[PDB]
Amino acid sequence: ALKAVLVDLNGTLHIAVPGAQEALKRLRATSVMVRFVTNTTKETKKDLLERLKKLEFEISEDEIFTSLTAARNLIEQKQVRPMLLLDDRALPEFTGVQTQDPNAVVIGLAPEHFHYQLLNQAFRLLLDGAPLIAIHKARYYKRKDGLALGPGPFVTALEYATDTKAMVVGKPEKTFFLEALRDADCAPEEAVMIGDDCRDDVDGAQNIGMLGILVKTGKYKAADEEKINPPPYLTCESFPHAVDHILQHLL
């Protein structure tokens, strides 16, 4: 009955977690589809794959899925020409997407685009009926010189200005999981997500009816499992442990 396993790529697989590359080879001995997922506004599948190959994982490219892929999929489903308020680094993920005469607004973390004039242009697309698509809505992030504005304040500004709500496509939001699961052509109920983040990874997956496994690596702190309802289907020490459980109980 288990058809797909989604695996967070950051803190679940490396900080390389010991046993991970072996545990994954073991998971592959089954027929389960394996997907490697992350929220990102900046990173390509090619870079992420690279980083994983360095670390001795056997992962192919068609297996990495991100916040950006979710946005490309939605773009292609809605058949819209987005204005891409994205870092120049994300744009390889949108090659072949039409952006001229735009009729949609896609917004990630794009400081160089996060100025009045270009924001006002986006505003006028939304007044005209353009859908607003947000990669995610984080208030801030940490950089070399301290906390800095993330994409969330700027999504909200556009939302405030137009009295509309963005479709958010990054974790914990439902779209991230449904698009990740799209290539397995399976129900969320027939999949599991493994992450070190009880909210973004595990609660997010379980809100659409996936089984969520919280691992005590990466950004996990003791009693994180207690902050969500219901609790994670399973909380365990690491990715190799998650995997043994899956082999035992779910396959």
The residues binding Mg ion (CB under 5 A) are 8, 10-11
10 annotated ligand-binding residue: yes
| HEC assignment per residue over 85-119 | ECCHHHHHHHCCCCCCCCCEEEECCCHHHCCHHHH
Q: Name the minimum Å distance from CB 205 to Mg ion.
A: 13
Q: Which residue is nearest to Mg ion (CB)?
A: 10
Please check if 8 is assigned to a binding site: yes
Which of 8, 63 has the CB closer to Mg ion?
Answer: 8
Per the annotation, does 120 bind a ligand? no
| Token pair belonging to 28 | 């592959």
Residue 103 CB, shortest distance to Mg ion, in Å, is 33
Of the pair 11, 204, the CB lying nearest Mg ion is at 11
Q: Smaller CB distance to Mg ion: residue 39 or 44?
A: 39
**38 annotated as belonging to a binding site for a ligand:** yes
Q: Which two tokens stand for residue 47?
A: 């870079």
Distances (CA, A) of 93 to 42, 110, 136, 174: 10, 15, 16, 21
Name the minimum Å distance from CB 197 to Mg ion.
Answer: 6
Sequence-distant (≥ 6) Cβ neighbours of residue 216 within 8 angstroms: 196, 235, 236, 237, 238
Tell the smallest beta-carbon distance from residue 10 to Mg ion (Å). Answer: 3
User: Is 15 in contact with 218 (CB distance < 8 Å)?
Assistant: yes
What the block records as the tokens of 221 is 């702190």
Residue 131 or residue 204: which is nearer to Mg ion going by CB? 204
Residue 233 or residue 239: which is nearer to Mg ion going by CB?
239
Instruction: Tally Cβ neighbours within 10 Å of residue 197.
Output: 22
Least distance to Mg ion from the beta carbon of 142, Å? 14
Least Cβ distance, residue 56 to Mg ion (angstroms): 19
- Is 10 or 175 the residue whose CB approaches Mg ion more closely? 10
The answer to whether 151 and 41 are in contact (CB under 8 A) is yes
Rounded CA separation 234/117 (Å): 48
Is 150 strand, coil or helix?
Answer: coil
Rounded CA gap, 214 and 236, in Å? 6
Enumerate the known binding-site residues.
8-10, 38-39, 171, 196
Enumerate the known binding-site residues for Mg(2+).
8, 10, 196
Enumerate the known binding-site residues for substrate.
8-10, 38-39, 171
